[PDB]
Amino acid sequence: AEGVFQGAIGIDLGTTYSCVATYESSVEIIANEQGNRVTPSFVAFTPEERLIGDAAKNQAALNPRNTVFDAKRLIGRRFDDESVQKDMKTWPFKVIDVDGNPVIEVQYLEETKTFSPQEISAMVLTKMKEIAEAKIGKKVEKAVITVPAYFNDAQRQATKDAGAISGLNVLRIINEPTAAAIAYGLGAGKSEKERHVLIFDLGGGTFDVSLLHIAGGVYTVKSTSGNTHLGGQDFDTNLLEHFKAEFKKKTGLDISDDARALRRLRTAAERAKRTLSSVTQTTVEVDSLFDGEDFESSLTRARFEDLNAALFKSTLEPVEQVLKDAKISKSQIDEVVLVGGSTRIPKVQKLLSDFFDGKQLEKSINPDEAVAYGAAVQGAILT
């Protein structure tokens, strides 16, 4: 027990970003060595070393064949699965078929090596463990890891297996939406007074809606829906195209083939989106965007909303589906919990609060951190 943490860390092993939390005297989300409270679920292999997290994502463009990401899209799946065959056409790294399983093949230290999805995820989980250890000052042996509610038994086992590989005793695999509810203490009393709770989780690349029944300490997923491939980055993309159009119109320049110019302009758009969650108008500037020309525009909240009209509206569909499927009316819903950074967008909150006739949404916990937070809460209950 000497020099070992007696608790269990909570890990949100996300598709694109991961987050780790612990609950000593209170629940804390842990920052990594670059001071970030989420860490890219990225592993890069180079002629000299392996990078995990921020450094891996930051060199992805320079090292695309050997920078691995989206392993959560493979884990516990089969090579000839339909999502897989499809996902593979979109990745710059090689995925091969070994005994019918997907396996990632890369160059590492000037040799060809292959990794299962569980092995890649284990490397991310090891990174999360190490991040937690650095802040705790102790070794971590126990964890609670979260997975999407639609994960099947193979996907769940493969995720536990990843944990084992990373030197963690995985006490429980819990559902992402359930973690978020636990974060808000919903059902914490373990009282027999029941609740129905809708989790609205709009991630950067994922949109998941889940209906929970909670009573007596038992969290039951009644129904689940979403858009796997719609997310916050899609809002950025619409603003990016709007800005590209403006720039080309004023200057005659097309930045489509300049990766750096595209990157800087998407950064401007991401920043502009965030500003517009707090205020209603902003300038948008990029100095010397292309061929000597400065980019300057402005954007109102109203215009931002119009540019994403259809997308925003589409977010109510899965809320309706989940109720329809569970045979539960919107009036029976006790809490609506917001997860994912994109839920900070005022319009998204408004469409949702209006659908529930002015109901206030649970949002006091950072939406990017809520899943990890509840995983940490569950970890403390188990230890």
Ligand SMILES: [Cl-]
């Ligand atoms: Cl995810």
Ligand SMILES: [Cl-]
């Ligand atoms: Cl993610």
Ligand SMILES: [Cl-]
């Ligand atoms: Cl630059």
Ligand SMILES: [Cl-]
């Ligand atoms: Cl700039």
Ligand SMILES: [Mg+2]
């Ligand atoms: Mg998430």
Ligand SMILES: [Mg+2]
């Ligand atoms: Mg300037």
